[PDB]
């Protein structure tokens, strides 16, 4: 007994293991287990492809499950490693199944860099292998029927999922075998053979003829359509066509023979005869034209036995008129069969190797979130610092809070003395002098590291060129020049980072040189400092003066405001939200992840309380600097312009400017120091990367 099956497609073996491992290492921390388990699995994958595909050999469910196991593992991997995004050079090469092309060759191949192409072929082979196992089954047997019926319906569903997946995934024209019309015809043949099987079970289980006639008729309807599809497109092996034709006929005859047992049961004798004659015609034709592909003898002997006896009984006894075919009611149809939907996992006991691996969808989103968090936070920080700077500069340029605390011109105003002690307490000028001294050394330490590193490259390159010049034959490997261009481009970049640092060093140094001497004064013991501040005869309207208490409370409000910026900045920086989860969720319940909208709404939840206040500071400062200047310019009427007070004025203005500068400078110097300190970390790893590559080579 002959059933159609499909042969596997062939593939050249490819390096799955290495292109994948590249991404893995360039995404997680080198030396950790989030780099470990995703290399142990990447190798097990590469092996598993070879075992599933690497040979057209084994012909049972061990090898089918390995294929199925392989299909599910591929499908599971797609949302990880960026395949959709193109920069992975994994190219899959498959050969036509049928040696068919829409061109006059003997074979044709397609090699594509597309996981979608890969997965279709794997599934075709799953379909095909299942077909071969089904065709092999022993059909006089309950497990034979059941295994074939399940495998044909799988093959039919597998081929149909291929029909609806190919053109989208694969962004080329597929080979003829995995082409929609082919794979759609194959799906229907598999469905048909699955009916055949159920028609065979009903026969073996001695079910009612009415039933069997209807199952045979359904099969015949399925085989006819498959036949038609084939009449004007020769895309399948040469044996498919005549087998479809014979099976179509045999199933019409089985339908007619069974319905003929009905007609007899109902004393429709002319109909018995007409239907039997039809069964005889089809089988006679099948026996002579398709003798290579079927054996139909018993059934022929059984038709004729039944027919002679009906004609004996009719001619003598009953005398029933034999109708034309055209006048007979259609035999019904009953399907007991379905194309099996493909839904991973199709393998049993499936386990996902890269289950723990976070999807790319999240990575991109999680990264892009951080660049939006970063803008919002620096945004807010820089705005505030710019403001406090500008407020301090205005208060200095107007001798405040000093002026309104300047009882006589005899002593050190309380605020100036307060600022002084803060400077003395933070170490004084020694702290600024020491940081300025060590800055060129931390610079030099970084130049040292960059040069020694590139020198390694230079020295290895020179000997590599000499060896290739002297031993042309004995020394053939890619030149050092080409291997080193990546590292040498990190190098030229680092250089530019250093060019920027130097200029910044310049800025701090000039400001340091421009303000040293006034700071040194500020740091002097209180009576010593008072001696260097010129005395003046005070403008004595400064007892209960109303213009004073307005400035006084106004400066308190300005003080409040700027002191508050400090707890704001710190809260802006100390908080954060791990967003992986909110991303994970939107991925599983929705089609895709839209981070923009999802992150905006969460950055408003986490940071909105603080961004509001940051804004309520800037504007509040604006308001305070408005009616501090228009208020001050009135206070200035109470003070008169003479030489002794112009002098004290400037010294006071300049001592306050000095405190501002000491504070700014300490912050700048400690910023430069941490920078040159983090940069050594960057550069040591670069120096290490240079020696590893100069010694691996």
């Amino acid at each position: 007994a002959t059933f159609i099956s499909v042969q596997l497609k062939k593939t050249s073996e490819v390096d799955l293991a290495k292109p994948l491992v590249k991404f893995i290492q360039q995404t997680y921390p080198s030396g950790g287990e989030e780099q470990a388990q995703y290399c142990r699995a990447a190798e097990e994958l590469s092996k598993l492809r070879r075992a599933a595909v690497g040979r057209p050999l084994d012909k049972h469910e061990g090898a089918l499950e390995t294929l199925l196991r392989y299909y599910d593992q591929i499908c599971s991997i797609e949302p990880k490693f960026p395949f959709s995004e193109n920069q992975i050079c994994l190219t899959f090469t498959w050969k036509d199944a049928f040696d068919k092309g829409s061109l006059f060759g003997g074979s044709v191949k397609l090699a594509l860099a597309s996981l979608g192409y890969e997965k279709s072929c794997v599934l075709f082979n799953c379909a095909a292998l299942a077909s071969q196992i089904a065709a092999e089954q022993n059909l006089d047997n309950d497990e034979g029927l059941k295994i074939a019926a399940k495998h044909y319906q799988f093959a039919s569903g597998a081929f149909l999922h291929i029909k609806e997946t190919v053109l989208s995934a694969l962004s080329r024209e597929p080979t003829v075998d995995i082409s929609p019309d082919t794979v759609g015809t194959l799906s229907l043949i598999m469905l048909a053979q699955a009916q055949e099987v159920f028609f065979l079970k009903a026969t073996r289980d001695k079910m009612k003829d009415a039933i069997i006639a209807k199952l045979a008729n359904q099969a015949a309807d399925y085989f006819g359509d498959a036949f038609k599809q084939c009449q004007y497109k020769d895309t399948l092996p040469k044996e498919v066509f005549p087998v479809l034709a014979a099976k179509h006929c045999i199933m019409q005859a089985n339908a007619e023979y069974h319905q003929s047992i009905l007609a007899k049961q109902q004393y429709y004798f002319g109909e018995e005869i007409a239907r039997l004659q039809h069964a005889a015609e089809l089988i006679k034709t099948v026996a002579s034209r398709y003798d290579e592909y079927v054996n139909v003898k018993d059934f022929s002997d059984k038709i004729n036995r039944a027919l002679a006896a009906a004609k004996k009984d009719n001619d003598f006894i009953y005398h029933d008129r034999v109708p034309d075919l055209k006048d007979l009611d259609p035999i019904g149809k009953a399907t007991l069969v379905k194309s099996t939907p493909v839904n991973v996992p199709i393998s049993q006991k499936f386990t996902d190797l890269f289950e723990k691996m976070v999807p790319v969808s999240v990575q991109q989103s999680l990264a892009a979130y951080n660049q939006r968090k970063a803008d919002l936070v620096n945004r807010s920080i820089a705005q505030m610092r710019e403001a406090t700077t500008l407020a301090n500069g205005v208060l200095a340029s107007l001798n405040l809070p000093a002026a309104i605390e300047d009882v006589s011109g005899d002593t050190v105003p309380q605020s100036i003395l307060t600022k002084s002690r803060s400077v003395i307490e933070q170490g004084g000028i020694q702290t600024v002098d020491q940081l300025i001294k060590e800055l060129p050394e931390l610079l030099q330490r970084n130049r040292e590291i960059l040069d020694e590193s590139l020198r390694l490259l230079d020295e290895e390159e020179a000997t590599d060129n000499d060896l290739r010049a002297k031993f042309k034959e004995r020394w053939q490997r890619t030149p050092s020049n080409e291997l080193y261009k990546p590292l040498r481009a990190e190098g030229t970049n680092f250089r530019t980072v250093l060019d920027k640092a130097v200029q910044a060093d310049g800025q701090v140094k000039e400001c340091y040189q421009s303000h040293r001497d006034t700071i040194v004064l500020l740091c002097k013991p209180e009576p010593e400092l008072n001696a260097a501040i010129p005395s003046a005869n005070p403008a004595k309207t400064m007892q209960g003066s109303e213009v004073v208490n307005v400035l006084k409370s106004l400066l308190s409000n300005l003080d409040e405001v700027k002191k508050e910026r400090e707890g704001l900045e710190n809260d802006l920086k100390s908080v954060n939200f791990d967003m992986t989860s909110k991303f994970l969720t939107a991925l599983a319940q929705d089609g895709v992840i839209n981070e923009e909208a999802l992150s905006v709404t969460e950055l408003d939840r986490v940071y909105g309380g603080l961004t509001t206040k940051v804004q309520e500071s800037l504007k509040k400062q604006e308001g305070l600097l408005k009616n501090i200047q228009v208020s001050h310019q009135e206070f200035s009427k109470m003070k008169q312009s003479n030489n002794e007070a112009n002098l004290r004025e400037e010294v006071l203005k300049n001592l306050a400017t000095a405190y501002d500068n000491f504070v700014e400078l300490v912050a700048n110097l400690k910023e430069g120091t941490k920078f040159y300190n983090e940069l050594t970390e960057i550069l040591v790893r670069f120096q290490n990367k240079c020696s590893d590559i100069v010694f691996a080579r």
Partner: peptide, 8 residues
Amino acid sequence: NLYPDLSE
């Protein structure tokens, strides 16, 4: 602020 960006 003053000193260049360290990110990569």
